[PDB]
Amino acid sequence: RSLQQRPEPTPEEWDLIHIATEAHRSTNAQGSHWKQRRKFLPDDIGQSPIVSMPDGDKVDLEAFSEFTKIITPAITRVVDFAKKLPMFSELPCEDQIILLKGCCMEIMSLRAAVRYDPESDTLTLSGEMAVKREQLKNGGLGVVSDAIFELGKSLSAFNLDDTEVALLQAVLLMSTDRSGLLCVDKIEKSQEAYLLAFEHYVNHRKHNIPHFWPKLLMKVTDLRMIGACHASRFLHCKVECPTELFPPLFLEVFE
């Protein structure tokens, strides 16, 4: 360890890595059998954008409905992921709440993006619903969909395993650029530990791409950006459409 040229995970990092990975696996829909269980979203759904949005990319109500009918269990599984992480569970529940809201979209988007299928040109939502670029964009997301598609297409070269996704999620979670946090230092400290463990795991993996780590960290920024666009776009939807169309937990996370 450190053994070939680049530092390997420490024993303490191996532990943190194992805990994060299992946290992700146990909360990640349809594990390694998503390619056989997924049903495509019918091609007549997603083609009819008619509710206006401030930026001019309209919303298709039927598609919004399809995506939001399945969103609660998806958000629920991100809450579940976070809770299996000891540095998350031991925070005040105020802090817990703020962190989940700050990273929910980021983690859900990542999870869809790692399930980008090149041959059909689709993302898989919750390991069960394979969607095209147009359907997802028209259903609410607008250009955020082009962003997750663009991220998913570029990640196929990266060959991320379950651990790098889990650690990516954990770094997205433990982030201090949110308003209203109590335990700011404990969070930074916990993020730093994941980042280092992450880096050293990437070292252990020996990817065939040069400069893998900074390339990966740049994919982090893309997610945060996807996250911030969605929070802008969510706010506009809440303005255009009635409450009744939004599942209580969807509202609770993004409102």
Query: Could you tell me which of 188, 220, 127, 170 has the C-alpha nearest to residue 19?
Result: 170
Could you give the C-alpha distances from 231 to 23, 101, 195, 255, in angstroms and in order? 26, 10, 25, 9
Residue 64 or residue 198: which is nearer to ligand T3 going by CB?
A: 64
Among all residues, whose Cβ is closest to ligand T3?
Answer: 140
Q: Is position 140 an interface residue for ligand T3 (rule: CB under 6 A)?
A: yes
| Closest-CA residue to 226 (of 126, 139, 149) | 149
**Residues contacting ligand T3: total by CB under 6 A:** 19
Q: Distance between CA 175 and CA 89 in Å, rounded?
A: 15
Give 111 or 200: the residue with its C-beta nearer to ligand T3. Answer: 111
Comparison of 131 and 174: residue with beta carbon closer to ligand T3: 131
Q: What are phi and psi of 40, to 5 degrees?
A: -55, 145
108 binds ligand T3 (CB under 6 A): yes
Binding to ligand T3 by residue 151, rule CB under 6 A? no
Name the region of 204 (left: φ>0; alpha: ψ -120 to 50; beta: rest). Answer: alpha
Give the interface segment with ligand T3, choosing from 18-26, 47-55, 67-75, 184-192 (CB under 6 A).
67-75
Query: Which of 122, 126, 190, 191 touches ligand T3 (CB under 6 A)?
Result: 126
Give the single-character DSSP code of 49.
-
Decide if residue 116 touches ligand T3 (CB under 6 A): no
* Residue ranges binding ligand T3 (CB under 6 A): 29, 64, 67, 70-71, 74, 77, 108-109, 111-112, 125-127, 139-141, 148, 234
